[PDB]
Amino acid sequence: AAILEESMHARDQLMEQNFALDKARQEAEMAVHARNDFLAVMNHEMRTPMHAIISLSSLLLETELSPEQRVMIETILKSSNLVATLISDVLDLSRL
Amino acid sequence: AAILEESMHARDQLMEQNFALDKARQEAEMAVHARNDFLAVMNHEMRTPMHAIISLSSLLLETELSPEQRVMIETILKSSNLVATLISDVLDLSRL
Numbered sequence: 001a002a003i004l005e006e007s008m009h010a011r012d013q014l015m016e017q018n019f020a021l022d023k024a025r026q027e028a029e030m031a032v033h034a035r036n037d038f039l040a041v042m043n044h045e046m047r048t049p050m051h052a053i054i055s056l057s058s059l060l061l062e063t064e065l066s067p068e069q070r071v072m073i074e075t076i077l078k079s080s081n082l083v084a085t086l087i088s089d090v091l092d093l094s095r096l
Numbered sequence: 097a098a099i100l101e102e103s104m105h106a107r108d109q110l111m112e113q114n115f116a117l118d119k120a121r122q123e124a125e126m127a128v129h130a131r132n133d134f135l136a137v138m139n140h141e142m143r144t145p146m147h148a149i150i151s152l153s154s155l156l157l158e159t160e161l162s163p164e165q166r167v168m169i170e171t172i173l174k175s176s177n178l179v180a181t182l183i184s185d186v187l188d189l190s191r192l
Contacts, residue, residue, distance in 0.1 A: 003100065004100060007100065010107055011103070011106055014107065014110035014111065018110060018114055021118055021121045024124075025117070025121045028125065028128050031192075032128060038186075038189065039186065039190045042182075046186060049178065049179035050179065052171070052172075053172050053176055056169075056171055056172050059168065060169070063165055068159075069156060069159060072152045072155065072156055073152075075148055075152055076149050076152050076172065079146070079148045079149050082141075083145050083146060083149075087142075089138070090135075090138050090187075093134065093135075
């Protein structure tokens, strides 16, 4: 019955190991959920300035510019378009 | 003992649970890692366009501008500097 004792002890160790695995997974899920919530909540704060820059660079192009100023402003518009788009993609990151 | 058989049976069930859990834990950890990698990719893809916007705005201000172009470009420099920092911070705070 030291055999029984040994069995019951292996049961304790397994139950310990199982809660351990359970804890780890739950921590990960929780941590991800909270960080995604934060990411989602912040999205309009990231996207609004990009929209401001898209509007402005776009409208600058309607004014009289040197050829150099124009290629530089084109690049601002094009860059801000891509960044807006990537920000939009990040908003898909919850939950895809 | 039939007692021992019931003890070993309980041990069996713990091992089955241990295996599902270990798998659930691995899958959760890969999910966390893939999400971190994506946020890093996102940060990577926005950084250079972001820098282009800030840099080009600054340079444009060294050139000959109507007062109207000047107020608009100044707004771009202000806005893009602040949002670059905000985006950088939010993506870092969103990780692990």
